[PDB]
Structures are given as structure tokens and as C-alpha cells.
Amino acid sequence: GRSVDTMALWLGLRAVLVVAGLAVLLQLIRGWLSSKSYVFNREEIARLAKEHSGLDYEVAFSKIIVELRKKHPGHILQDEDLQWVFVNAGGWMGSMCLLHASLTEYVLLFGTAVDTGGHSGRYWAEISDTILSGTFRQWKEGTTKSEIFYPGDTIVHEVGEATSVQWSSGTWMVEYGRGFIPSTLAFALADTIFSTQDFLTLFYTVKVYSKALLLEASTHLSQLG
């Protein structure tokens, strides 16, 4: 009867409960024990973006890239490999220009020309965004109130944290990721697989990531011989 169905539903809920729990546990285990070889530090990227946040965001883009190439030669994609690629993740739509990416880090220019918002993603990685233009509203888990951030500010998305993010038209930022970068690909590609069906954008995304990986491998081989 009604009690039997309640018990069976509770059994199935406990089944999904322990599956999701152990999946989170494995995410924590893979992440905490993951490698931590760091070329950059988030304060370095944040100060460099905050210095040029008063410029037109495209002029800021160029000066940030030139400085990143001067201070970290061999770790930034050349001009021929820079490309604006749409990003559809967690219900929002923006675009990116990948500058650096490895197993443990990534650096990219991010933003949107449309009003958008959605889920931030939850992963074992520390993501930081320094706003060059526009507005960035963040709604943290466990709260009923959100906060808006402006050019010059830096939002630090902590490891294991989940937020709601919302950007206005013409918002652009410099983004630095640190942690277990591969564990973020599922979030980055989900809306392409199950919503947009934009397989050429998927092609673009894995192409620039593979190029960034090959750049790091080529530089690591040259630093040893």
C-alpha cells in the first residue's frame, strides 16, 4: 500500500544517496592527492588584471597577454592558437580565449556579450576571476542573498564550493584555475553534449586544450634537454 511504496522509494533514495556520496568521496580523493605543479599564482594574475581593469577590456587583454608571455615564456599560446570559443556550462553561455592550460593550471580570458547566468560547477579546483568590465553577481550556497562585483574585483571560487553566477552583457574577466583541471571537463562540456549539440564548438574546445597541453610538454622537454 502507501507504506510499502514509501519504503521502496526510501530504499531507492538511499541507493542514489550512497552512489552520489561515494562519487563525491572519489572526487575528493583524486583531488587532494592530485599533482600541484604551479607556474603561476592567483595573486599574480589578479594584480595583473586589476592594473589594466581601467582600460578598454580588449586593450587590457593584449597587455595582459604580453606581460604573461614576458614573465612566463613558453607557457602561453602563441597568437596563431588564440581563438574565441563559446562556453556553454551549467545553464550559462559565455566565451573564452585559452592562454595556458596544463594538468594542474589554466589561464584564460572569459566573458559574455549577452545577459546570462547559471550554475558555477563544483570541482576540486580553485577558480579566480578578476573583472575587467561589466558586473559579476555571485550567490553562495547556504545563503538567501547575493553579492555583485565590479571591475577590479576578484571572485575566488573555492575548492568544493558551488555558487550561482550571473553576468551582464559586456562583462569580461581574466580567469585562473588551479587544482585537478581534468575533473572540470565534464561540467564544461555537459551543456554542449545535452543541450546545444554544438559539436564544432566541442571540437574547438578540445583542440585548444590539447594544444595548450602540447605546449607545456614541449617546454618541459626543452627545460631538461
Next chain:
Amino acid sequence: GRSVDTMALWLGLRAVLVVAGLAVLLQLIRGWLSSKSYVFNREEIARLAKEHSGLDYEVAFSKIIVELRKKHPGHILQDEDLQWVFVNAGGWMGSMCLLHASLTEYVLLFGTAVDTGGHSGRYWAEISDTILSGTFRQWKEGTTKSEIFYPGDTIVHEVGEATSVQWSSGTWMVEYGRGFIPSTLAFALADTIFSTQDFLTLFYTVKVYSKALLLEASTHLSQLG
């Protein structure tokens, strides 16, 4: 040629046609014959939320919970089990605090701190939302015009009805569901499975639902012995 491909496509469309049709028919059969044991009634929840809609929505939250505990003891989750959990469904992102849930009913606090909107879901359940703060725009199926609702109003999402819903930042409401509650889980979890990949939020969602079910089972056992 062109006529052959048109016929084959029409055959496949009829295939998807009869599959979706019989799936809807089974949804109607399971729902109409589902159980209907009711602890609350929607007018009770709506009047209680409308009375406190003039307060700060968090003060309203507390007074509504206290009143629901006084009038329905044994059917509201204790303070230790209350938690704000993100809800990603039908393209929108809000958050909930589950107070009561069974096979046939649920009562929760709902809202969002970001501008969001999307599909309401179509299921065999009668959902009603009494706005405490913010704005609630509803766009009904079969019409080209939408309506906006304000604090004190109650939107009644009818059984089998589908709407587009849109909430502004800082909109909060009291929500009561009545019907075949399990048939709504697929809509509630879809964007977590196929977009956000937020498995810890999924863990949170099934945990509070299982706790609410266990509360109802514990109370039903005590009312008999």
C-alpha cells in the same frame, strides 16, 4: 528520393509520436490512481504565507515554520535537518529548504538570489507558490502573453499544466505540492544530471527527501503504536 526520405522521416516521427503519447498516458494512469492522503491543504499554506508576506522574508520563514510545527506536529523537519539546497531544473536555478515531504505532499521554502527562469515542469501534481518577496512572472501554454505576480499572490500550477516561469533576484515564496510527488523527481534532477554535474547537491537533495519520508513513517508508526 525526396519522397522516400519524407516517408521515412514521417514514419520515425510517428514512432516518437506514439512513444511520447503512451508515456503521457502512463503518467496520467499512475497519477489519477495514485494515493491521496493529505496532511495539509493549499489554502492553509497560502493564507499562512500571505499573512507574513509583509515581513522580511526570513522573518516570515521562521514564523511560517513555527506555525506549521504547532498545527501539524510530527510532519515538519526539525531545525537540525533544515538546509538551503540549490535547485537546478528546467533551465532555472533557485534554492529550497524542505520542511515536509511524503509520497503525496511536500512543503518547502523556495526562491532565488539571481535572475533566472525556464520551464516549470509537467507532472501529475498541483503546485502552489505564495510569494513573500520579489516578482514571479508566469507564461501559460497556448498564450502569447505573460503575467507578473507580487508578494501576497499565489500561483497555482495545475496538474498536467506546463508554463514558463521567471523570477527576479531576491524572490522568495512558500511552496506546497500535492499529487504523485515521485513523478516530479526526474524534472528536479535532470539539470543536475545533464548540466551542472553537481553530485553533492544531488546528494543533499535525496538526503533531505529521505529524511522527510522517514519522519512521516516514524509519525505514522507512532499514531498507531
Next chain:
Amino acid sequence: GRSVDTMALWLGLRAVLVVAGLAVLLQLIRGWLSSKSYVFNREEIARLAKEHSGLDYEVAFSKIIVELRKKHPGHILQDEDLQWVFVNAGGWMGSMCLLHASLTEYVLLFGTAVDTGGHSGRYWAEISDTILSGTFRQWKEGTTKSEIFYPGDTIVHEVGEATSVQWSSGTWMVEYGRGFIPSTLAFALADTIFSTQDFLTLFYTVKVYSKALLLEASTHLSQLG
């Protein structure tokens, strides 16, 4: 170690790379060699919608349908088969009224009563939208700036192009599609399959498409005997 994992990840990225690439290649092959039997032309639909863009969009709807029936008898669905059906695709939510659809073309009334936006879709089809009311913001791939279009304007979504689209509440338009129409169904239904779970809307969508196909088949049989 770290180099081994980098190589393995690069191998898997190249795997996804060549899969998505050949899927795009097959999309191009099917599309370029697809049939091109055309009842309408986009300038015809655009001028007819632009003439009536100064009217109330519902009065414009009726006059456009009457004119399309007068100039293309046997290719427009009768009043009994006209229906507003929700469209959930690429993260946005609108609604449509299908007037004509074949293997190579389609004509429909489109719009939304809510603020929405998302991915446009990428397919081998040329889509054109003439705005009757509201605002249409388009963000093209490879750019950091978007453009807004107004009643009387026509946006032409080119073959293979991907954009971000965003519409304000009360935006309505006349839409004409030309190309390999079946290759667009996956984009049109994805958010229904993996987000909204609205199987009755899916039932509605394949019903009107099958009816439009059957209309074209019936007219083609009568034009020969």
C-alpha cells in the same frame, strides 16, 4: 607520473577531437548534398513580415498567414492544425506556431513572453527571423560584442554559424528555415529530453511536424494526379 597523465589526457583529447571532427564532416556532407526543393524564398517571407511589423503582432500573425495561404495554397497548415507549442532549445525557452514544414523548408511564428536567451544551434540550415515586436540581441562567434535588432529587422543565421541569442519579454517574429531540416531536430529536442522532461510538448512537436510533412506529401500527390 605527471608527464604520463598529461600524455594520456592528450591522447583522450585527440580521440574526442577526431570524433567531433568527423561528425562535423558528416554533417557537412549530408547537408551540402541534401535536397534543395524550395517553395518559398527568404526575401518573400521577410518582406511580408516587415510590412506588418507595425501592427500588433497578433494582427500581423493573421495577415501573414492569410497571405501565405493565398500565394502558396496547399503548403500552409489549416486553422485546425495551428497550435502554440513551447520550444526549449539551447538553454532558451520560447514558443512556436508551425505553418509549413518539409524536408528542406519550414515556416513558423516564433517568440517568447519571458526574458530568455542561449545557444542558437549549429546546423546545415539557413534560418532567418523578421522581428514583429520586441528586441533580438545576437552575439556572433569570434567576437566580444553583440548587436540588438528591432521590429522590421531580419537576422539571417547562416549555415554552420553559431551565435548566442537573447530575446526580451514580448518579442515575436516570423521565421523561415531552409536547408537540411531534419538535422536540426536534435537541437530542438535536446532540452526537452535532458532538462524539461516535458514529453507532452515533445508529443506536440512531432505531431505538428508530421502533419506538415503529410500536408506537403498530399499536395505533391495532387499536383501529379
